[PDB]
Every structure is written in C-alpha cells, then in structure tokens.
Structure 1
Amino acid sequence: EPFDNTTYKNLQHHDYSTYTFLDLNLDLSKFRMPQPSSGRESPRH
C-alpha cells in the first residue's frame, strides 16, 4: 500500500489473446438495456 511510483501496474495486457475483446463484450451483454427500434427489420424492408 505505501506509495510506490517505480512499477508499471498495467501488465495484464501481456496475457490478452485473439478473442479477448469479443469475449468481454459477450459477458457485457447481460448488463445492457433494451435497444431502441426503428420500426422495420432493415432499411430494405
């Protein structure tokens, strides 16, 4: 806990992998909110 300014604490990214970013977005899905709807399945509908 004593103030140490001599270490690089952002060392987690040395372990990240190819699918990391999308896996975390999958885990974040439950926390979202109902998206808004235009009223049509697509502009081509």
Structure 2
Amino acid sequence: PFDNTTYKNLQHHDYSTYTFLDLNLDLSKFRMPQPSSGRESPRH
C-alpha cells in the first residue's frame, strides 16, 4: 500500500567510521581504467 507517514531513510543510523571508505573499496571493481598524464607526477 501507499504510506506517506514514516521515515524511510533509517539505514544511516547503522553507519560507522569506515562505511564510506568501505563502500569506495567495493566500487573499485566496477571502475574503468584511469587515464594517464604520461608520468608518475609533475615532478618526474
């Protein structure tokens, strides 16, 4: 049924210190290879 009387954004009550970086680590396998500037850094 249709309910407009409850808050449905309660998952973040269980988030912790490493939630964001853990999610970032999980996303790594989906990324496309990064482009390259041709050197290790501007100092190479």
TM-score (norm 2): 0.98
SS, match of residue 30 in structure 1? helix
Q: Which runs of 4+ in 1 moved over 6 A?
A: none
Structure (1/2) with the larger helix percentage: 2
| 1:12-31 aligned within 5 A | 12-31=11-30
1:19 & 1:27 partners in 2: Cα distance? Answer: 12
Task: Let me know the Cα RMSD of the aligned residues.
Answer: 0.3
Supply the distance in 2 between the matched residues of 1:17 and 1:34 (Cα, whole angstroms): 29
Deviations, residues 14-43 of structure 1 (Å, cap 9, x unaligned): 000000000000000000001000000000
**Kindly, what percent of the aligned residue pairs are identical?**
100
Figure out how many residues of one structure are paired with residues of the other and give that number.
44
CA distance in 1, matches of 2:7, 2:24: 26
Q: Could you list the runs of 5+ residues in structure 2 that have no partner in the other structure?
A: none
